[PDB]
Amino acid sequence: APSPLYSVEFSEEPFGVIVHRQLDGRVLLNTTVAPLFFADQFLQLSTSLPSQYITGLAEHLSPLMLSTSWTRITLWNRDLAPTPGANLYGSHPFYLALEDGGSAHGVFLLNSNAMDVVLQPSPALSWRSTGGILDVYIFLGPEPKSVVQQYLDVVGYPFMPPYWGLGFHLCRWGYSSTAITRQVVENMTRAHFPLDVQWNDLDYMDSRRDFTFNKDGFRDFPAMVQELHQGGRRYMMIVDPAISSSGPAGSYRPYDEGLRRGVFITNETGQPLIGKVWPGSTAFPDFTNPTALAWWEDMVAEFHDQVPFDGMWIDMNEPSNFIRGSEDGCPNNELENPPYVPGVVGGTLQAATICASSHQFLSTHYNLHNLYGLTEAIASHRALVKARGTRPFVISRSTFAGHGRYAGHWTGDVWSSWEQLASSVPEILQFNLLGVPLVGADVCGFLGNTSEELCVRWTQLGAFYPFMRNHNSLLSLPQEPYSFSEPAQQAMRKALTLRYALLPHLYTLFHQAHVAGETVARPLFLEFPKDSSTWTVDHQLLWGEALLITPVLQAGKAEVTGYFPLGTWYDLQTVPIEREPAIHSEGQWVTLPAPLDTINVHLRAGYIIPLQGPGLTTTESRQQPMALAVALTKGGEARGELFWDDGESLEVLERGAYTQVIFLARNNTIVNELVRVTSEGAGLQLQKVTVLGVATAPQQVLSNGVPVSNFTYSPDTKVLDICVSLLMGEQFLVSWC
Amino acid sequence: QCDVPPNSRFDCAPDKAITQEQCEARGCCYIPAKQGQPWCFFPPSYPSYKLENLSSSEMGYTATLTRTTPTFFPKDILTLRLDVMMETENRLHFTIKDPANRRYEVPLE
Ligand SMILES: *[C@@H]1O[C@H](CO[C@@H]2O[C@@H](C)[C@@H](O)[C@@H](O)[C@@H]2O)[C@@H](O[C@@H]2O[C@H](CO)[C@@H](O[C@@H]3O[C@H](CO)[C@@H](O)[C@H](O)[C@@H]3O)[C@H](O)[C@H]2NC(C)=O)[C@H](O)[C@H]1NC(C)=O
Ligand SMILES: *[C@@H]1O[C@H](CO)[C@@H](O[C@@H]2O[C@H](CO)[C@@H](O[C@@H]3O[C@H](CO)[C@@H](O)[C@H](O)[C@@H]3O)[C@H](O)[C@H]2NC(C)=O)[C@H](O)[C@H]1NC(C)=O
Ligand SMILES: *[C@@H]1O[C@H](CO[C@@H]2O[C@@H](C)[C@@H](O)[C@@H](O)[C@@H]2O)[C@@H](O[C@@H]2O[C@H](CO)[C@@H](O)[C@H](O)[C@H]2NC(C)=O)[C@H](O)[C@H]1NC(C)=O
Ligand SMILES: OC[C@@H]1[C@@H](O)[C@H](O)[C@@H](O)CN1CCCCCOCc1cc2ccccc2c2ccccc12
Ligand SMILES: *[C@@H]1O[C@H](CO)[C@@H](O[C@@H]2O[C@H](CO)[C@@H](O)[C@H](O)[C@H]2NC(C)=O)[C@H](O)[C@H]1NC(C)=O
Ligand SMILES: *[C@@H]1O[C@H](CO)[C@@H](O[C@@H]2O[C@H](CO)[C@@H](O)[C@H](O)[C@H]2NC(C)=O)[C@H](O)[C@H]1NC(C)=O
Ligand SMILES: [Cl-]
Ligand SMILES: [Cl-]
Ligand SMILES: [Cl-]
Ligand SMILES: [Cl-]
Ligand SMILES: [Cl-]
Ligand SMILES: [Cl-]
Ligand SMILES: [Cl-]
Ligand SMILES: [Cl-]
Ligand SMILES: [Cl-]
Ligand SMILES: [Cl-]
């Protein structure tokens, strides 16, 4: 029947907006519960919540489901190592609220001011903002996955990363020469560890300045990067927003040209606000100024002409300041000293950043602060498109709602601790719900020293982060895969091998995120919302609908207990890649064996996943034959898909420059359905079909009507492994009986 | 008027440490927690905005909101405009703005 999912009514006095779900009459929003405040620097709007289950309101170190026990959540972008109760690098004023029975809705407050969000156990929520207007969107779902898609309809669907961006990334603070940086690639290669992308931190720079490289350790920087490209790898390096202001006039083009074009945030007298960051005195680019965008495009393109980097790692874009406000302090006014200061670390909007009353092209820093990182990511996305002519790869510390349309994120300066390994799962899930699916934590942790056991477990779980980078602090002990004992190296290699085998699937999941507003890493409650036992699960994750990952997140464990929704879950260990074979769950907790060399991964019955053969890079792996893993229902059914393009071109979906194939298992047959076949995808070789849940040994296996060269059946695991010679882009029929 | 269940008490002193006398002078209720929950909270009669001139548009609704008693914050905007837009079957959108002054809005496409 044509009608909205919502109905709206108003309270006259006191004023309130009341939103019902039409289908069951549930009250979703009711702003009559508390007074409306609307003062120049204080907005407060409250509502009842439908349940005690609410997620969102990044960026904080917390469970996926937020506490309603008088919790104050502060949105004010801040450079601080992740710790509970603190405003961190990003701000996302969106929540998703679950309703009894498994429906959900979402609320977005389109407001970029410093804010507190207060949750109370009635249950209820109060938005408390320090400026701007109330601009409120309600998304009616009813499925949690539909709420997320509807939110991303407003803020933007996730960008499509290049395929190579899904490979392994390796970085540290402290690779102090091209010789040492090359030895990292050599050492990974010697020990058969895949590595798509070598990174540097600020080591490369001349006197810690952007768009320079030192002529000591990094004299042959251009040659190093050209050599990485010759070997089939990409290169990433850190870029800071702050620009050295102290160099002799005419000696440092980024500053000299920025000054000429007026690209910087200015103060009361109209001069550049000067802070202190890595090179000493710095000015801060204003990424709301169209002229700053042109300047940034030029600085990136000119630097790319010297050193052909493949993306940008944008750090310290809160913006982070080593001193409070500016070298000259900040004026005493109502923006610097507002009537309501949200619960920010340090008790002032100025702490670890620039003056709130500083001037930007569109408004004051007071209003735009929470957009600083996002505006730099937009500027960097555009700069990289213009410089390279292929898909950009931007990884940003600071974010705001809609970030995922332009860039990915890493969760910042996490300790090498079992607690932060565990905390990374809810945080990666939270960023997926917020449309930033390209997210991960520093594998093995950033601060302090990892242990070998922690780094095995962290590599195992981290291989299921959509963005997988091992990164390490300056004073830390080394933590590259090859730096560990042989048994630890074997476990880390197996984790990277499995991730590389799954890359066609992971890429297809990113395609669904980009075209349909889907999550890549998703909590169980997004897939099984009608099972209320899933609502508090945040130490397991799904990839898409079908792949359940149950990591060990504690020292000294050789088992793990995880939730299994109703259905059959096949142990992915039964699928050949270059302990019960099936969990038959009624919706229950299951204790799994999980020795040090193991991470539990189960494939949901009814799904088919595409795999590809091995390589130490995606340049190599993308040339390998493919395989299917076919997880049959009891009834003999399964479905899956593959999206394939050239891995890096712009405007692929608009130009139709891709292949899209559906796989269907029914009645002891497997077929493909050709949605679109083009030159990109045409010669993809299918050489192996592995079928899980085959109750009896077949007498014969046919491929296109002829007995196959070879197959094996295991009566113990119920797996049928079939050798074939087929093309993804040509109709085939595989059958058994 | 002050008989509000503890979990349903909304904080009338979010801005500062307050005494019972200051709390009651704001027109709020002062009830210490027995053990967080706000001690100073709004009665159901606390002055808010009143809805006036609710009107129907092809997109949804528009109204005036009027506050007659100031809050304890400086620079209350006493006259607001409400716009309600029924944008899709699953997306409802509303704004509350100052009709007399353009205020800062987040740039969004
Ligand atoms: C609620 O709306 C009413 C009615 O407003 C009128 O109708 C609307 C659909 C719009 O077209 C309005 O632009 C239009 O004015 C408001 O009451 C009205 O207030 C105005 C301004 O005070 C009154 O104007 C006066 O009219 C008399 C002669 O009739 C003159 O002598 C005065 O100089 C002055 O122009 C108007 O009479 C009055 N109308 C009615 C029916 O009461 C009301 O203010 C508004 N409420 C709020 C809070 O905004
Ligand atoms: C706005 O930003 C500008 C910088 O772009 C600030 O300029 C600074 O002004 C201070 C004086 O207030 C200068 O300090 C002086 O330096 C000289 C020697 O160089 C010294 O002899 C004086 O005793 C004093 O320390 C400072 O040099 C200058 N900075 C630069 C880069 O020129 C200005 O103060 C800012 N305005 C406000 C209101 O914050
Ligand atoms: C991280 O470890 C480093 C280095 O630790 C030392 O060397 C290792 C090989 C290992 O065997 C450790 O047990 C050694 O103690 C720490 O840096 C050292 O810190 C100590 C005490 O602060 C200092 O006296 C040493 O001289 C430092 N050594 C070096 C080589 O820098 C660092 O403190 C550790 N970090 C944390 C957070 O524990
Ligand atoms: O790019 C490095 C690092 C990334 O690896 C990380 O992933 C990312 O989240 C944060 N960045 C910036 C770290 C800034 C720390 C400064 O901490 C005080 C500080 C440390 C420090 C350490 C070594 C040498 C000099 C300094 C220094 C000099 C002046 C003022 C302050 C300092
Ligand atoms: C929306 O919230 C308001 C305020 O909490 C509710 O209105 C109160 O309802 C109680 C119980 O029916 C009454 O005794 C009060 O007089 C009402 N207060 C006001 C200020 O009107 C209201 O019921 C909620 N609306 C819905 C549909 O749940
Ligand atoms: C790459 O691996 C080489 C070989 O293991 C490392 O070189 C050794 O490093 C240790 C210090 O930890 C020295 O004591 C040895 O003299 C080195 N051995 C050889 C054969 O050169 C090297 O440091 C590794 N480099 C990186 C960047 O990881
Ligand atoms: Cl909870
Ligand atoms: Cl290139
Ligand atoms: Cl303007
Ligand atoms: Cl403004
Ligand atoms: Cl349970
Ligand atoms: Cl349990
Ligand atoms: Cl494993
Ligand atoms: Cl064949
Ligand atoms: Cl008192
Ligand atoms: Cl007061």
Numbering used by the authors:
A (entry chain A): 204 to 781, 794 to 952
B (entry chain G): 81 to 115, 123 to 196
The authors write:
We developed and applied fluorescent activity-based probes reporting on either human GH30 lysosomal glucosylceramidase (GBA1, a retaining β-glucosidase) or GH31 lysosomal retaining α-glucosidase (GAA). Gaucher disease is rooted in genetic deficiency of the retaining β-glucosidase GBA1 (glucosylceramidase, glucocerebrosidase, member of the glycoside hydrolase (GH)30 superfamily of glycoside hydrolases)10 and Pompe disease is caused by genetic deficiency of the retaining α-glucosidase, GAA (member of the GH31 family). GBA1 and GAA produce glucose, but do so from different substrates and by following distinct reaction itineraries. However, and as dictated by the opposite (compared to glucosylceramide) anomeric configuration, it does so following the reverse reaction itinerary: 4C1 → [4H3]‡ → 1S3. Both GBA1 and GAA-mediated hydrolyses proceed through a flattened 4H3 transition state, a feature that, in combination with the occurrence of a covalent intermediate, can be capitalised on for the design of covalent inhibitors and activity-based probes (ABPs).
Further outlined in this paper are the identification, from our libraries, of GBA1 and GAA inhibitors and comparison of the two datasets yields a set of hydrophobic, N-alkyl-deoxynojirimycin derivatives that inhibit GAA, but not GBA1. The binding-mode of one such compound, which we consider a potential lead for the development of pharmacological chaperones for Pompe disease, is provided by means of a co-crystal structure where the inhibitor is bound to the active site of human GAA. Of the thus identified rhGAA versus GBA1-selective inhibitors, we found compound 15 of particular interest. It features a branched apolar phenanthrenyl (PNT) group, which apparently negatively impacts GBA1/GCS inhibition and it might be worthwhile to explore this design in more depth with the aim to identify selective GAA inhibitors. With the aim to prepare for such future studies, and with the thought that structural features of branched N-PNT-DNM 15 may be further optimized in a structure-assisted rational design program, we sought a co-crystal structure of a proteolytically digested form of rhGAA (Myozyme®) with compound 15. The rhGAA nucleophile Asp518 interacts tightly with the iminosugar endocyclic nitrogen. Beyond the iminosugar moiety, the alkyl chain of N-PNT-DNM 15 establishes hydrophobic interactions with the rhGAA side-chains of Met519, Trp376, Trp481, and Phe525. Finally, the side-chains of Phe525, Trp376 and the rim of the indole ring of Trp481 provide a hydrophobic stacking platform for the phenanthrenyl moiety of compound 15, which in turn makes further hydrophobic contacts with Leu677 and Leu678, located at the entry of the large groove leading to the rhGAA active site.
